[PDB]
């Protein structure tokens, strides 16, 4: 899934690549090959890099189910994980199966 490319980590990577492409220091096609490697690497790290669980509540606005991916947008929603609690009045949730 080329899902995690528009994240801080993924975008900083693309920007770095574009420069190298711009200066012909680094070029495309190769760039695509690097991104492909990134997909495998980020996916692999997520599924087996550990994790911690919790439970919470919310209010809704729009929803979307396309290509087995849910995209929600909640309003006035606060989520608490373990000790920490985070308030929010606009949160977007993208979820893959």
């Amino acid at each position: 899934y080329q899902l995690y490319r528009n994240t801080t980590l993924g975008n900083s990577l693309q920007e770095s690549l574009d420069e190298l492409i711009q200066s012909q220091q680094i070029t495309p096609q190769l760039a695509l090959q690097v991104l492909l490697q990134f997909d495998k690497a980020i996916n692999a790290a997520l599924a087996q890099r550990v994790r911690n669980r919790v439970n919470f509540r919310g209010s809704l606005n729009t929803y979307r189910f396309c290509d087995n991916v849910w995209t929600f947008v909640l309003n006035d929603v606060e989520f608490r994980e373990v000790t920490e609690l985070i308030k929010v009045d606009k949160v977007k949730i993208v979820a893959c199966d």
């Binding site: 606005n61 729009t62 929803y63 979307r64 189910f65 396309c66």
Partner: protein
């Protein structure tokens, strides 16, 4: 006792071919999953209503609790659809089914009714707890539970729900515990 309407299901034709995927991406509160069902489910908060907007341009609206509320909610859905930009028309806002509920306020003996009215009434304890008294002269299916709540379903117009309850009221009054 006066029965109170609980659901109005209506069909209104928008008049033109609609691309379902485009509607789902831009409209708010809109779900479209092709595998489970073939229509966009759209709802609105101001008048509670869940509407399936079909691909060929036929729209079915459900969840409204009165006639005027259903026409207004369908008018609302048509405009939500128009503002996207598809050509839009409003045609034949016709009510299909109205479900109404009421309480006689007295305990009722279902078993007795089956004995003297086996022709129009069918009751099986295992399948469902309540007798169904399908009535022919006013076409309505009335479900009577033992406690006394009667739910009337299938009436295309407001008068039928009221007329059937008045017609079934003497029979229940006779079998009153």
């Amino acid at each position: 006792i006066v029965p109170q309407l609980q659901n109005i299901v209506s069909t209104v034709n928008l008049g033109c071919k609609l691309d379902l995927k485009t509607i789902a991406l831009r409209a708010r509160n809109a779900e479209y999953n092709p595998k489970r069902f073939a229509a966009v489910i759209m709802r609105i908060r101001e008048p509670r209503t869940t509407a399936l907007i079909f691909s060929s341009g036929k729209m079915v609206c459900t969840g409204a609790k009165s006639e005027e509320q259903s026409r207004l909610a369908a008018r609302k859905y048509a405009r939500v659809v128009q503002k996207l930009g598809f050509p839009a028309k409003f045609l034949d806002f016709k009510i299909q089914n109205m479900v109404g509920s009421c309480d006689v306020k007295f305990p009722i003996r279902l078993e007795g009714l089956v004995l003297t009215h086996q022709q129009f009434s069918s009751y099986e304890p295992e399948l469902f707890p309540g007798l169904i008294y399908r009535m022919i002269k006013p076409r309505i299916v009335l479900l009577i539970f033992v406690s006394g709540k009667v739910v009337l379903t299938g009436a295309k117009v407001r008068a039928e729900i009221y007329e059937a309850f008045e017609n079934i009221y003497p029979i229940l009054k006779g079998f009153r515990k």
